Each structure stands twice: as C-alpha cells, then as structure tokens.
Design a protein around this ligand. Structure first.
Ligand code: A1ABX
Length: 284
C-alpha cells in the first residue's frame, strides 16, 4: 500500500498512537547481559536503554570492552550504522576509541549539549583550533581544523591522532542544531537537506567504516535518521518503489537496537520525511 495513502488514512482516523503501540508489541527482545554488569553502571546514561549482546560494539581492550553502542546492518540497502548514546564524562575516551577502531569517516549529532536546561551529553570535541583535547585513558588527540556554521546545522573538520602510532585521520562532524526541545520539526525539509549533506560527504559509503550516529539516548532522533536514509535507498534500488513498508523496515532495525523511534510523533515525522524525500529519489 503506497505509504502516502496509508499516511492520510492514519491521519484522518487519528490512529498514530495505535500503530506505534503495535510496533512496540511486535519488537524483538534479546538479552543485554553485558550492559547490566555492575562494573558498567557508570558507562550507561539511561537504565532502560541498553545495547543487545549480539549486536553491541566491542572496544579493542582486554580490561573492559563495553560501550553503549549497537551495529545496525542492512543487506539489501547495503548500509550499516553505529547508533550510540551521547557520551558521558567518563566515556568520551571510549567514544573516540570506537570511531578509531571501526574506521568511521563521519559522526552525526542530532542534539544540543544543553536542552530543557539539563546536560544531554558531554562537550566531547574542541571548540577552538588552538585548544586541542587529549584522552589519556585511550591515547588519542583530537584537534578542531575548521567549522562551517549554517542556519539549521554546523559541519566541522576534526583531526584524530592515534598517539600510539602517530597515524592521523580526518573525521567529519555533522551537527543538526535546530531539533526542538519538545515535539518534532513542523516540516522535514531541513532534516532531509541535512541527510543529503551527510550522504554527499562519503560518510555513509561502503569504502568507510559505519557512520556513528547519536542523540541523548541514541534511539529516538537517531532512529529517525537511519530509518529515513534506509527507506529512501530501498525506493531507489527496487523496480516497484511502492513495495517499501516503513513499519517492516523499523521492525528489522529494532532487531539490532531496542526502542528506535520513541514516540508516535517521531513515527509520523519519519513517514513525512520519506514521502517528501521520495519526490527527489523518483527523478525531480
Ligand atoms: C520484508 O523485509 C525485508 C525488506 N525490508 C523492508 C522493505 O520493505 S528490509 O530491508 O528492512 C529487510 C531487512 C532484513 C530482512 C528482510 C527485509
């Protein structure tokens, strides 16, 4: 069923809450035993958001390999994503260790450091060229190279150095700065513009490690970004664009991380973004 007609049918019937609860009921439940070990309590931002054991990213160290991060792998679309929480004061070094070890080119940030008057993640990148950051626990150095501030997002060029080997890499930081403190954006135009800028950079392409995507918990806004990207790529690759079922794609993604799409409003916004984005994919 063409999703645009499914959309108008749910909107006229006002059944978004009902569709959303159906997804919550059918979603996968896998063990998260490593996340719940007492040694890992200060590595989790939220007690109720954990990576499944089967899909968690492992740090390359014998001490403690744990980070709150999941690998979402899609075969047909040919895309992989790492979804993670906003880093904590004691996990900023683990965060950059993961980017290094997984060979990521891009970091996608969908939150502000402060929202609703509370801290939603650590200040984990340098704000001035001449004031670099050193992460002594993981032996990494991070330098701000350049910053491009636009109305709806900022793009930063960062240099990450492995102090152990003196290898360096360029990391691109894509920061969506205008998601509202409450609800979802009224139009998906600025979110789709941002998605297309990440795509254009090479950050989502198979010659690199998976993109790292985060918000505060790494399930809500983060879920919306990967769901929209994958659905638009499937509409491109297939003979029948209309064959794409956004609810079935979301359930596939929830096999790899719990809780993706946190509200019925986030589900409606994801539909809007895919419907409006398809009017480019199909030749405009
Ligand atoms: C029917 O489900 C298919 C197609 N997908 C939905 C698009 O209609 S999927 O790409 O999310 C996917 C992912 C893993 C396994 C199977 C599937």
């Amino acid at each position: 069923m063409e999703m645009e007609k499914e959309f108008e049918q749910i909107d006229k019937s006002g059944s978004w809450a009902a569709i959303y609860q159906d997804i919550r009921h059918e979603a996968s439940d896998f063990p998260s035993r490593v996340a719940k070990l007492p040694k890992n309590k200060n590595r989790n931002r939220y007690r109720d958001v954990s990576p499944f054991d089967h899909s968690r990213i492992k740090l390359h160290q014998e001490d403690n390999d744990y980070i709150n991060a999941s690998l979402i792998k899609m075969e047909e679309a040919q895309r992989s994503y790492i979804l993670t929480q906003g880093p904590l004061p004691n996990t900023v070094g683990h965060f950059w260790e993961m980017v290094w070890e997984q060979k990521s080119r891009g970091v996608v940030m969908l939150n502000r450091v402060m929202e609703k008057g509370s801290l939603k993640c650590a200040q984990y990148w340098p704000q001035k060229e001449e004031k670099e950051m050193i992460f002594e626990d993981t032996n990494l150095k991070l330098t701000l190279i350049s910053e491009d501030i636009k109305s709806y997002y900022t793009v930063r060029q960062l240099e990450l150095e492995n102090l152990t080997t003196q290898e360096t890499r360029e990391i691109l930081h894509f920061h969506y700065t205008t998601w509202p403190d409450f609800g979802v954006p009224e139009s998906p135009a600025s979110f789709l513009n941002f998605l297309f800028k990440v795509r254009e950079s090479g950050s989502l392409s198979p010659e690199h490690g998976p993109v790292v995507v985060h918000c505060s918990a790494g399930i809500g806004r983060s879920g919306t970004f990967c769901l929209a990207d994958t659905c638009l790529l499937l509409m491109d690759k297939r003979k029948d664009p209309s064959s794409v079922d956004i609810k079935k794609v979301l359930l596939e993604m929830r096999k790899f991380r719990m809780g993706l799409i946190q509200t019925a409003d986030q589900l409606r916004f994801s539909y809007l973004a895919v419907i409006e984005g398809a009017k480019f994919i199909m030749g405009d």
